[PDB]
Structure 1
Amino acid sequence: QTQQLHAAMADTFLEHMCRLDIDSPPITARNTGIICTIGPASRSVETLKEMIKSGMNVARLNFSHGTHEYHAETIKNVRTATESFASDPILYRPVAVALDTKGPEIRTGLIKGSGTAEVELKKGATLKITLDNAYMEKCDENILWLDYKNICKVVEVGSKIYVDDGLISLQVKQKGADFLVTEVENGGSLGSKKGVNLPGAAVDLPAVSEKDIQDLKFGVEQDVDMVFASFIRKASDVHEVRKVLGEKGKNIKIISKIENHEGVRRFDEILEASDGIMVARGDLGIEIPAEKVFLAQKMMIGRCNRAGKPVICATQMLESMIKKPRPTRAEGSDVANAVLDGADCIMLSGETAKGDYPLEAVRMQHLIAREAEAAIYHLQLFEELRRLAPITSDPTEATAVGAVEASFKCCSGAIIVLTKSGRSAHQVARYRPRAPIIAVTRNPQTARQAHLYRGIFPVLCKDPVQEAWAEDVDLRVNFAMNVGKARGFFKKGDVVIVLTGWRPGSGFTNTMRVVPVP
């Protein structure tokens, strides 16, 4: 048997686990989007073509470093590689471009006037934090300057301060006007201009920094598809990002990065305002105990799935592959479990941006994701999603859930969906069918953004609009059939589900057909 179908039929989750079968091969289609950070290892046109062939769906640009010029050139290269495949629309894969903001930061000053010097902090010693700029280049083991002018307003006696990616830990023992007397908990080497984290604080840094405002404007100019917004703490932060993107950027998707205690606790209001979520495990695991990160990951993925909004699992998923051609067993497991949890997309950072084996890391995420998709317990998942969802008068919703149900009953090879804005295909994806969703659109931005949703394989129709609308619809259905055949999703005579609407604009999807592949 294939596709873990024996497991699929189990009446209990435990039996489902007992039936997982290494000799049950997956289907060809892989539903989980792969987001790859582009950097020195992966930025040439030549490598990018291979990244695409290996499974990259979204190119992430990390604006923490690099100039506008550098990023503009990366994006140019991504598009060159992407479009090199455009001559065969059956085989072309859309590739989205995501801008990931630097975001607000807290930084220390210079040790001893140097950028490279360091000092030793001993566990239990005193360290005074000063805001007084006289000390901004005279940091030492006694006096630490940092740039967050309001720090005193947001911490209390007992508060912790983490320095240099959580390497050093301090506890506030006394608060002054413009200073904090701290005791070192975890000591270590303190260097220059290090990152500061304030675990449990309501930090009042602006939603977007001066640099972020410039970067977001540049993302609009560059026609990016989505923004990963750093350090989102509250709904109003999302609103600020949306306002910066403005009218011109109104169709760019905002993915809030949840990376501290506040963001986790205010998650509901953040999700409601956002187009989707990134579980930003790197910073999140600096801010909160590392042993608690899996809780926040499963919380966020569950609530995103409940809301029907895309969620990304990010950071260190295949970390060892920076240096090695094969992942660890914990890494394999992490990727599989993220898909099992419900993540729409999984991400690579240093693995693709700077490591020695970027192609292998992409291919590995592809292999794991496809195995894990088969191992989902759809029988329980679909039951729960359908119960948790509202009853509505919305005809498109009723059509989508009916298509998903039909797809399980006939084990279809695909659900084909015509969509202008993406929405009809998003509505199908939210019910987590096993079958891949082939979303046919003429809208290039729809095609790129659809990668955010589990299961959506976007295909970009380039044909002229036919004079007879019924023929225009049939043309697009036929395109999807050719795509699925060419990509090995299904073959002639297999059964597939087709979703269309009753007239041309958006919002009329209402027709479900069960048809043999011609």
Structure 2
Amino acid sequence: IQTQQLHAAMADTFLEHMCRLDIDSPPITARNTGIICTIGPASRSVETLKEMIKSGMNVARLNFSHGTHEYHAETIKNVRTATESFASDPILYRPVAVALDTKGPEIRTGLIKGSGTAEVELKKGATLKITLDNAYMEKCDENILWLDYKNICKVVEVGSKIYVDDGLISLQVKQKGADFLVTEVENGGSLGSKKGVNLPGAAVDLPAVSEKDIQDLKFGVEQDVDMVFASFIRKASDVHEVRKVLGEKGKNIKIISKIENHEGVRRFDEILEASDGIMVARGDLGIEIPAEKVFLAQKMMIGRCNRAGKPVICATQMLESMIKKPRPTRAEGSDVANAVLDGADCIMLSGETAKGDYPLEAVRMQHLIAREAEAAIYHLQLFEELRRLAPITSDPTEATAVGAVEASFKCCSGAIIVLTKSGRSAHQVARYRPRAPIIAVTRNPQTARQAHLYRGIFPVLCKDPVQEAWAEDVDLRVNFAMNVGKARGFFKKGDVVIVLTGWRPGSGFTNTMRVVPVP
């Protein structure tokens, strides 16, 4: 009762649950919410990556809006060197997924005075000309600004608003020309090179998948990435385009659709159906739609992803102040906790890990907050509603999954151990949101990496050879999971755990649930 918020867990109402939340009730060891870290100059070394893994990084995200293939290939090599440095003991080895985040249909400005790091300070109530004349693509300054959206003039009008750099610089269109726009600075500030531009009024007509995106996706297949985070998905056909480009060689790569504009929110259901998962890409979303509405979009998408059993990621500015400071703001601590309470499978760090001064501290803080928030979930109602809203099916795997989760609550189990080839069995357990960690034992390295997308899954990669006698191969993997849970302090000899197995080899036959004491 006095740990894991178990007193609050037993409340008969949500209000009383809130009233019983206890800062002196410490959480379990296991942290269920996956942490996605963007890798860049601050976190790209093998040395730092080892520490990022030890601090809780589950997925390395590469943002292809920046950097050459050479650069990203080296980052990927370093991630794998760091990750495989722990491979000698499979009991302690932590799989690490690699994610390719596409540029997509972005608009960006040019170079301020010929340099990538130069800046000019735009005073408010000034005049600024936007041009498409490539003569100025590297000669941006206080007076003239080039950007790379050739067809911009057709989709904007006088009075249209144009936003630059995370929506912070604000411009109003006064006149239009053949290949320019004369604007007045509505909100000023420093203007740097190659900054993101948004046209919230307008229907931007760029390709769902550009030539650059084709190149990058090919690279992703060549580099054996686990997942693609696809930028600016507006409709199911965009998802299908990425899927078709990845083609047969990339058929097992998971597609996470990033929702970052009004159309994506409107067509969310068809996007979700077509996708392997979703990212709430709050950065651009909060520029494209009023910032005060983002929380509605966030909770709608997390809700709908939870109902569908598909992974959802909360992204962007979660611990933003930690780019410059060792500790986060109170709003940031709140945001991370509330993303977990909403139901997000994963949470993400961008500049905080890619470029900031405290990457390890940012990972460590997400880890601490997620674990406290996981204990604070009102499982009583959540599990009731998930059961009630679930399609009724004669599928034996689904019945075993729900039985296992019910059982896990009844005996407050230290874990649910699941043997899985493709991950699907463990995903089915995760969809019902147990408190207990799900130890997913697999021999498939890609399954192990991809499983990090799901709340609660702790993937472990068995490297023991296959035993002649299948039943004894099954027991070998179960015992492996016992060794892992024990070594990582999830449970100890005599605790009770749940174990899911199947009746024959191959995927699709999980049907056996056992409640067993830890050896």
TMscore range, shorter length: over 0.9
Correspondence for 2:450: 449
User: Could you say if the C-alpha distance between residues 468 and 120 of structure 1 is closer, same or farther in structure 2, counting changes exceeding 3 Å?
Assistant: closer
Q: Is it true that 1:336 corresponds to 2:344 in the alignment?
A: no
| 8 Å contact from structure 1 (residues 407, 496) kept in 2 | yes
Correspondence for 2:60: 59
Provide the rounded CA distance (Å) in 2 between the counterparts of 1:243 and 1:494.
Answer: 48
| 8 Å contact from structure 1 (residues 440, 480) kept in 2 | yes
Q: Deviations over 1:145-165 (max 9, x none)?
A: 543233344345554322333
User: Could you say if the C-alpha distance between residues 46 and 125 of structure 1 is closer, same or farther in structure 2, counting changes exceeding 3 Å?
Assistant: closer
Secondary structure in 2 aligned to 1:324? coil
Once the 2 structures are TM-superposed, how far is the Cα of residue 69 of structure 1 from its aligned partner?
1.6
Once the 2 structures are TM-superposed, how far is the Cα of residue 486 of structure 1 from its aligned partner?
1.2
Q: Deviations over 1:243-280 (max 9, x none)?
A: 22111111111111112222222222211111111112
Note the aligned Cα RMSD (angstroms).
2.5
Q: Deviations over 1:273-332 (max 9, x none)?
A: 111111122222232332222222212211111111111111222222222222222221
Aligned 1:276-315 pairs, distance under 5 A:
276-315=277-316
Provide the rounded CA distance (Å) in 1 between the counterparts of 2:78 and 2:191.
Answer: 39
User: Could you say if the C-alpha distance between residues 112 and 223 of structure 1 is closer, same or farther in structure 2, counting changes exceeding 3 Å?
Assistant: closer
Q: Deviations over 1:124-176 (max 9, x none)?
A: 77766555667767878787654323334434555432233323333456667
Once the 2 structures are TM-superposed, how far is the Cα of residue 109 of structure 1 from its aligned partner?
5.3
User: Could you say if the C-alpha distance between residues 115 and 330 of structure 1 is closer, same or farther in structure 2, counting changes exceeding 3 Å?
Assistant: closer
| 8 Å contact from structure 2 (residues 110, 193) kept in 1 | yes
Q: Which range is displaced more, 358-367 or 173-182? A: 173-182
Correspondence for 1:421: 422
Provide the rounded CA distance (Å) in 1 between the counterparts of 2:45 and 2:192.
Answer: 34
User: Could you say if the C-alpha distance between residues 35 and 192 of structure 1 is closer, same or farther in structure 2, counting changes exceeding 3 Å?
Assistant: closer
Once the 2 structures are TM-superposed, how far is the Cα of residue 184 of structure 1 from its aligned partner?
4.9
Q: Which range is displaced more, 391-400 or 141-150? A: 141-150
| 8 Å contact from structure 1 (residues 201, 261) kept in 2 | no
User: Could you say if the C-alpha distance between residues 267 and 134 of structure 1 is closer, same or farther in structure 2, counting changes exceeding 3 Å?
Assistant: same
User: Could you say if the C-alpha distance between residues 96 and 109 of structure 1 is closer, same or farther in structure 2, counting changes exceeding 3 Å?
Assistant: closer
Q: Percent identity?
A: 100
Q: Which range is displaced more, 116-125 or 364-373? A: 116-125
| 8 Å contact from structure 2 (residues 58, 97) kept in 1 | yes
| 8 Å contact from structure 2 (residues 128, 142) kept in 1 | yes
Secondary structure in 2 aligned to 1:446? helix
User: Could you say if the C-alpha distance between residues 81 and 264 of structure 1 is closer, same or farther in structure 2, counting changes exceeding 3 Å?
Assistant: same
| 8 Å contact from structure 2 (residues 43, 353) kept in 1 | yes
User: Could you say if the C-alpha distance between residues 306 and 77 of structure 1 is closer, same or farther in structure 2, counting changes exceeding 3 Å?
Assistant: same
Q: Deviations over 1:385-413 (max 9, x none)?
A: 11111001221111111111111111111
Provide the rounded CA distance (Å) in 1 between the counterparts of 2:508 and 2:422.
Answer: 9
Q: Which range is displaced more, 223-232 or 292-301? A: 292-301
Secondary structure in 2 aligned to 1:440? strand
Provide the rounded CA distance (Å) in 1 between the counterparts of 2:450 and 2:140.
Answer: 46
User: Could you say if the C-alpha distance between residues 208 and 387 of structure 1 is closer, same or farther in structure 2, counting changes exceeding 3 Å?
Assistant: same
| 8 Å contact from structure 1 (residues 228, 257) kept in 2 | yes
The count of corresponding residues between Structure 1 and Structure 2 is 518
Q: Deviations over 1:437-487 (max 9, x none)?
A: 010000000000000000000011111111111111111111111111111
Once the 2 structures are TM-superposed, how far is the Cα of residue 30 of structure 1 from its aligned partner?
0.6
Correspondence for 1:176: 177
User: Could you say if the C-alpha distance between residues 258 and 200 of structure 1 is closer, same or farther in structure 2, counting changes exceeding 3 Å?
Assistant: farther
Q: Is it true that 1:144 corresponds to 2:154 in the alignment?
A: no
Provide the rounded CA distance (Å) in 2 between the counterparts of 1:191 and 1:48.
Answer: 29
Provide the rounded CA distance (Å) in 1 between the counterparts of 2:51 and 2:190.
Answer: 41
Gaps of 5+ in 2: none
| 8 Å contact from structure 1 (residues 174, 182) kept in 2 | yes
Name the TM-score, length of structure 1 as normaliser: 0.93
Provide the rounded CA distance (Å) in 1 between the counterparts of 2:502 and 2:431.
Answer: 19
Provide the rounded CA distance (Å) in 2 between the counterparts of 1:175 and 1:369.
Answer: 49
Q: Deviations over 1:216-266 (max 9, x none)?
A: 111111111111111222212111211221111111111111122222222
Secondary structure in 1 aligned to 2:171? strand
| 8 Å contact from structure 1 (residues 200, 262) kept in 2 | no
Q: Is it true that 1:404 corresponds to 2:405 in the alignment?
A: yes
Secondary structure in 2 aligned to 1:34? strand
Provide the rounded CA distance (Å) in 1 between the counterparts of 2:355 and 2:115.
Answer: 28
User: Could you say if the C-alpha distance between residues 158 and 12 of structure 1 is closer, same or farther in structure 2, counting changes exceeding 3 Å?
Assistant: farther
User: Could you say if the C-alpha distance between residues 375 and 268 of structure 1 is closer, same or farther in structure 2, counting changes exceeding 3 Å?
Assistant: same
Once the 2 structures are TM-superposed, how far is the Cα of residue 187 of structure 1 from its aligned partner?
4.5
Once the 2 structures are TM-superposed, how far is the Cα of residue 209 of structure 1 from its aligned partner?
2.3
Provide the rounded CA distance (Å) in 1 between the counterparts of 2:112 and 2:85.
Answer: 50
| 8 Å contact from structure 1 (residues 109, 138) kept in 2 | yes
Name the TM-score, length of structure 2 as normaliser: 0.93
Q: Deviations over 1:175-226 (max 9, x none)?
A: 6776666565435566665432111433221112222211111111111111
| 8 Å contact from structure 2 (residues 166, 283) kept in 1 | no
User: Could you say if the C-alpha distance between residues 176 and 352 of structure 1 is closer, same or farther in structure 2, counting changes exceeding 3 Å?
Assistant: closer
User: Could you say if the C-alpha distance between residues 119 and 498 of structure 1 is closer, same or farther in structure 2, counting changes exceeding 3 Å?
Assistant: closer
Provide the rounded CA distance (Å) in 2 between the counterparts of 1:318 and 1:279.
Answer: 16
Correspondence for 2:162: 161
User: Could you say if the C-alpha distance between residues 145 and 56 of structure 1 is closer, same or farther in structure 2, counting changes exceeding 3 Å?
Assistant: closer
| 8 Å contact from structure 1 (residues 200, 261) kept in 2 | no
Once the 2 structures are TM-superposed, how far is the Cα of residue 22 of structure 1 from its aligned partner?
1.0
